[PDB]
Design a protein around this ligand. Structure first.
Ligand SMILES: CCCCCCCCCCCCCCCC(=O)O
Ligand SMILES: CCCCCCCCCCCCCCCC(=O)O
Ligand SMILES: CCCCCCCCCCCCCCCC(=O)O
Ligand SMILES: CCCCCCCCCCCCCC(=O)O
Ligand SMILES: CCCCCCCCCCCCCC(=O)O
Ligand SMILES: CCCCCCCCCCCCCC(=O)O
Lengths: 254, 56, 238, 266, 266, 60, 56, 266, 56
């Protein structure tokens, strides 16, 4: 072992290599594995698809402004339109997978900032109006980032999610969000963040279009900054890889 | 089936019998303590000793 | 039949009784056990996790993420203080809300240590040293830096694995303490002073912030389970 | 349990167990004997009053519903759920998937009402608290056919003795209870979204068995749950905003903590 | 428990476990792994909540008869039979010849009536529920000689305690109970035809033991049977038309099933 | 005598209780067992028998 | 006469004594499961295997 | 255990076990057989009814507080302490540091009040005596949220049966109870000085569970402590002046003993 | 755990069992007598015999 700060990951067809990174946080202490034949209840045979599904699908990018609050994604839904993971997701009826989340954000030695890369299992949300429940087009984007705000929510539109960043939108203390697995991105000494998450859920296999497994949240606790005479555009990107996929219950598409 | 087990002393024994068919009629398993902190604190892949520096 | 009498206490209802009882549905077969990742076998597993502290809570800086970052400057006259607060988990207005402050309110006693972590989040050209003192209570809030240097302290310098951990030991006459604010069983204080200024080359913003984590050590415990006074209900939620 | 301490002497090496990196998501493991020189004291404490077995297994109120004796609609009913009281709700939301038994208990009470008859002499009353699982018959009056209880489990108890208590297995569909649900119920992804999509649990009916009187009596039952054999997975942060809906998570944003008049003020 | 499954591979032989003849009165024995290729999953279920031992042994109401305290004819009587309630009748008519024990139970209740006296203070009441087999003495008032019960079995119970319960052996003339009888009682083949030709079973009497009062109280008893050690022979199809007579099988013809608006409509 | 207390739940009536009890007629001798053909030892014995289906159910 | 038998577990022991003279005072024989389907399904005389055709 | 005696004969030596010096703070050890000639008698007595185990372990009254049923503030409360009754206080002040368990007992009573309604028929009442440790929630009315008792220990008891009793471990902060404290509570040595500086012990609440009536009833509870496993250290002289304050030692000086009319008068 | 110990006779046996988990549910330790007077009477350093004179 020489020069700890360099990693390398070759999963299937893609490879992501960082030179300046921290350690790798591996789930709750387990590596994602297939489903044993002692805990299954499906009566069909599964379908370990290919290397063609365990790949590195990169999602959209965004700009880290100087007033931005935070973004998030829904994991089983963000990869709905990507390659052969989005075809075996809708043609079948069941499935279980694990992911390998990644994040890139690189700045010079004259910038500053921080971020909290964390994934929350079973993330709920709260509508703006108390009586109603949130919409769907205001809860999940089509692999495009959803963003928090500074003002709380207003009183509209009776279905919008409440983007109150200091409460996280779930109704908890934002400082206590370090229980779920995570990693910090400090531009002083960091350039990325890796996270390996297994499949955590009550039932053995669950639908993909009806119930979202996890939720990826990004929150900058310390805003960007820089003196005059430097690049004012700092973008962010994320790369995710389905790990150990399986399916059951073949039907027509939807 | 009676077991003569230990008690909770500050720093003896006490008998016990079950009388029903099911398993939901017994008492709680209060006298059981099992700890493992490694799952939540230190979930990293590479093991880190506190003597060596953190990042190289 | 067998003749026997009944002592007092019979035919009552203890809220914390440990007695057997019949079964409504007999011969029930639960679903077989499943093995999911991550099992909380104790409530001290959660305390030993680290969580940031809302130190800079003031008149307005509470409805934003600005209550989590201590502001550090680069000034002329040395010995300036950066922050400070008394040491009382679950009693003080700063630690009564964190991850250790929300578990310590379900009980009444506690005894152990505390690990306070910091993280300088300035640019990579920034530099500086800091002092971190814990003065047990005989006379608190040291005004000068030389008053605080007599107590337990540590000296931390930034850059290349900046984060430093101060370990508040356990120094008390008795064995336990009260989570509530009790003047007989006070704990102490905590402060941090400028050991050396914040120097920076040109073309670098001089204002740099710091985050303050808190966690429990491994000689920690609790006792005397109670009910927390935070949640309060007015009527049944229809 | 807790661990002991160890005696330390002065050092000038390059061990540095203090400085570390927090970006790696790794909580430190520094003890007080590492950063300063200390004595040797063997701790005799024990982490026993904090385990989930001892922390949860206490009874608490859930719901008290009353039913008058006046008319043919005296009976009262309740739909099972645990998110109706604030004390026991928040003691569940520090985990995600639980597994436990229960020991029910009903502390029934009575009271008189105004009347005009000359004298009153009320014999003891009896109940008769029924349990109807989901998808079954239902009563509509206090003289119905459903009260036979040919297969339903009922409890008969006369006022004046100790209260009734009984156990309950892990009756569910999944491999563990779910306190948080993220997703809808219809495959079209429309309609109901919250946690009640996978909560039916049955019903609960109560009734006076006595014929009638001259008062007539009014009564109020009180439920009490006590999770017996717990198992918890996937902890999460506690709640910070008050509850305002029974089957939602809607809240009103509040400050993270109370305020002090300075940063350096004690 | 139930049986497992077995892994199947593609085949092109002439096994054909699908096509068979149904004229032979033989139900097929095809499992899913025979007709298509499947996985291997070992079932852990158990057929326990469906056996006749667990399916029948629950108590149910049979008959509740009341008797006032006013006059010298207060007492009330009942003739034994099980075809008086719809819930427990149909749970018997899926078999033909049964054999079981029983555990009786009487949930007695009381109630006041209008009166004119100044005050009322009613001490506890007592019963006194008797059993008279067929061909024996009979009482006609609440102050008769028959209430001595020199050989008859009686039960005395004061109001306020738990209800009375007791067992009963397989008391019958034949080697098993008969729920359906096809044939008459007279050798001339005339007169009575139904099932009550071989059902006497005795009687059942109840009475207030207290002298009198000023109310006076009214009461209603409720019977509860619980077949304990069952054995069933010769099953038959369940019932489809409602019951309308106590000792007949008369019915009113109805449709075999509710209707849908098409043959292909879902 | 032996001193002991009674937990809650006592003096009730469960519809599905499994308790012993006295006997009204003691020293009774039932008729000896007889062996007739066809004994239903379970209720899944009946389900596995085949029965026609009223598929074409419509207006009339 | 006491017997220490098994209990109903999802996937222990429990004692029991009789106190009366007759046999109608014991509890039900719930813990008994015996299956035989051949009487109702397949009552035919000639045995038929599912591989061979039904009628010749 | 007591000791025997030994036979002594006349002596004329220089043993002199009588004359000694009392300045050395040493109690003598002279027995009767040393100073005079006596017989030999073996004592069969036993010092058993005087040990601290047998001397202290008897129940005694501590405090009786009453609470009416009239209004929304019926409930009554009490702060724990043992220096409120004269009999049990002085039986503690012959030692300095104790250590024991306890067995509580509450002898609850009732009584009627004047009213105007025609008739009255009061069913049995129930309690509901709660215990709130220091630093916890508090109730303010008889219909509050605090009465759920999710973690607090409560006792429910219906009038007419035996009184409730329970045990209590050695719940304290120090290694033994302290009955006398010499020193203040503030480090500045100002303010409170007496013994209550280290006495909180919690609270104690009581309440009627019944809804209401027409009397309405009034009740008075009575506490009873019984130290079980005692251990005493550092005895001291008993008290000579009466008690006059609950948390002080203030007194009024009195004569050391009653008086006789002479020095030589018998 | 049952012990058959002695009783208090003027001048036999009596059984006993514990039924709970804790130690504060047992009965008092009445049948225990241990005496030592030397702590309060005669606390002096040099030992003094009653035959020899007190002070020289
Ligand atoms: C007379 C006996 C009746 C027994 C009634 C059984 C009550 C079932 C309790 C259901 C479990 C509690 C709910 C857990 C999760 C949820 O649904 O919110
Ligand atoms: C006080 C004890 C009285 C005991 C009374 C015994 C009641 C006998 C029950 C008869 C069996 C039930 C009827 C089965 C078949 C039929 O006759 O329809
Ligand atoms: C329903 C159970 C309630 C139990 C209440 C426990 C009472 C604690 C007793 C405290 C010890 C007595 C005081 C000793 C010394 C002092 O404080 O003066
Ligand atoms: C219904 C139980 C009655 C009370 C128990 C009396 C003792 C009988 C012997 C029990 C021995 C069982 C085996 C064991 O010790 O676990
Ligand atoms: C009336 C029964 C009293 C309770 C039983 C106490 C134990 C006595 C020993 C019983 C042993 C009987 C033989 C057996 O184990 O089956
Ligand atoms: C709950 C206790 C039931 C009454 C005791 C019945 C006797 C059972 C045997 C007890 C033997 C325990 C060992 C001992 O003698 O100390």
């Amino acid at each position: 072992g020489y020069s700890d700060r360099v990693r390398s990951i070759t999963l299937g067809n893609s490879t992501i290599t960082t030179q300046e990174c921290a350690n790798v946080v591996v789930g709750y202490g387990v590596w994602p594995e297939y489903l044993k034949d002692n805990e299954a209840t499906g009566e069909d045979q599964p379908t370990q698809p290919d290397v063609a599904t365990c790949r590195f699908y990169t999602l959209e990018s965004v700009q880290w402004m100087k007033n931005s609050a935070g973004w998030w994604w829904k994991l089983p839904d963000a990869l709905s339109q990507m390659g052969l993971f989005g075809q075996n997701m809708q043609y079948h009826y069941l499935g279980r997978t694990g992911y390998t989340i990644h994040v890139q954000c690189n700045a010079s030695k004259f910038h500053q900032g921080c971020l909290l890369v964390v994934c929350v299992p079973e993330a709920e949300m709260g509508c703006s109006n108390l009586n109603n429940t949130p919409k769907f087009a205001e809860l999940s984007g089509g692999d495009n980032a959803r963003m928090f705000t500074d003002t709380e929510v207003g009183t509209s539109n009776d279905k919008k999610v409440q983007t109150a960043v200091w409460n996280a939108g779930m109704g908890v203390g934002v400082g206590n969000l370090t229980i779920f697995p995570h990693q910090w991105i400090n531009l002083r000494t960091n350039n990325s963040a890796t996270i390996v998450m297994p499949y955590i859920n009550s039932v053995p296999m669950d639908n993909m279009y009806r119930h979202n497994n996890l939720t990826l949240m990004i929150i900058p606790f310390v805003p960007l900054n820089y003196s005059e005479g430097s690049s004012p555009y700092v973008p962010i990107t994320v790369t995710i890889a389905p790990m150990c996929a399986e399916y059951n219950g073949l039907r027509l598409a939807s | 089936g009676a077991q003569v087990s230990t008690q909770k002393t500050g720093a003896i024994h006490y008998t016990n019998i079950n009388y029903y068919k099911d398993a939901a009629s017994n008492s709680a398993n209060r006298q059981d303590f099992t700890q493992d902190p490694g799952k939540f604190t230190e979930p990293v892949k590479d093991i880190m000793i506190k003597s060596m520096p953190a990042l190289n | 039949g067998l003749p026997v009498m009944t002592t007092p206490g019979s035919t009552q209802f203890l809220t914390s009784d440990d007695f057997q009882s019949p079964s409504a549905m007999p011969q029930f077969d639960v679903t077989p056990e499943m093995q999911i990742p991550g099992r909380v076998n104790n409530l001290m597993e959660i305390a030993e996790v680290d969580s940031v502290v809302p130190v800079n809570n003031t008149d307005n800086n509470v409805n934003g993420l600005k209550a989590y970052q201590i502001p550090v400057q680069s000034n002329s006259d040395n010995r300036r203080q950066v922050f400070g607060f008394p040491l009382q988990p679950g009693a003080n207005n700063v630690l009564n809300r964190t991850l250790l402050g929300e578990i310590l309110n379900y009980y009444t006693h506690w005894s152990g240590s505390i690990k306070l972590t910091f993280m300088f989040c300035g640019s990579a050209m920034a530099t500086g040293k800091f002092l971190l003192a814990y003065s047990p209570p005989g006379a608190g809030v040291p005004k000068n830096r030389r008053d605080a240097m007599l107590g337990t302290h540590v000296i931390w310098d930034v850059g290349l694995q900046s984060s430093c951990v101060l370990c508040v030991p356990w120094i008390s006459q008795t064995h336990y303490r009260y989570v509530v604010e009790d003047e007989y069983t006070a704990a102490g204080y905590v402060t941090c002073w400028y050991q050396t200024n914040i120097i920076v080359p040109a073309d670098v913003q001089s204002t740099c912030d710091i985050l303050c984590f808190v966690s429990a050590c491994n000689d920690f415990s609790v006792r005397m389970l109670k009910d927390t006074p935070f949640i309060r209900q007015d009527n049944f939620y229809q | 349990r807790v661990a002991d301490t160890v005696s330390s002497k002065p050092t000038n090496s390059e061990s540095i167990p203090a400085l570390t990196a927090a970006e790696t998501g790794h909580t430190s493991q520094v003890v007080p004997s590492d950063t300063m020189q200390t004595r040797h004291v063997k701790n005799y404490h024990s982490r026993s009053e904090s385990s989930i077995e001892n922390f949860l297994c206490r009874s608490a109120c859930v719901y008290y519903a009353t039913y008058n004796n006046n008319s043919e609609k005296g009976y009262a009913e309740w739909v099972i759920n645990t998110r109706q009281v604030a004390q026991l709700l928040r003691r569940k939301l520090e985990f995600t998937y639980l597994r436990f038994d229960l020991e029910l208990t009903f502390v029934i009470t009575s009271a008189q009402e105004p009347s005009t008859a000359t004298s009153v002499d009320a014999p003891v009353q009896t109940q008769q608290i029924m349990y109807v699982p989901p998808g079954g018959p239902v009563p509509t009056k206090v003289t119905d056919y459903a009260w036979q209880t040919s297969t339903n489990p009922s409890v008969f108890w006369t006022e004046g003795n100790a209260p009734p208590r009984m156990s309950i297995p892990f009756i569910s569909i999944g491999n563990a209870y779910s306190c948080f649900y993220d997703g809808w119920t219809q495959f079209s992804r429309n309609g109901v979204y919250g946690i009640n999509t996978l909560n039916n649990m049955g019903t609960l009916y109560m009734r006076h068995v006595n014929e009638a009187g001259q008062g007539p009596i009014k009564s109020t039952v009180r439920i009490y749950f006590k999770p017996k054999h717990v198992k918890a997975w996937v902890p999460r942060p506690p709640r910070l905003c008050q509850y305002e809906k029974q089957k939602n998570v809607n809240f009103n944003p509040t400050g993270v903590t109370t305020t002090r008049s300075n940063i350096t003020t004690t």
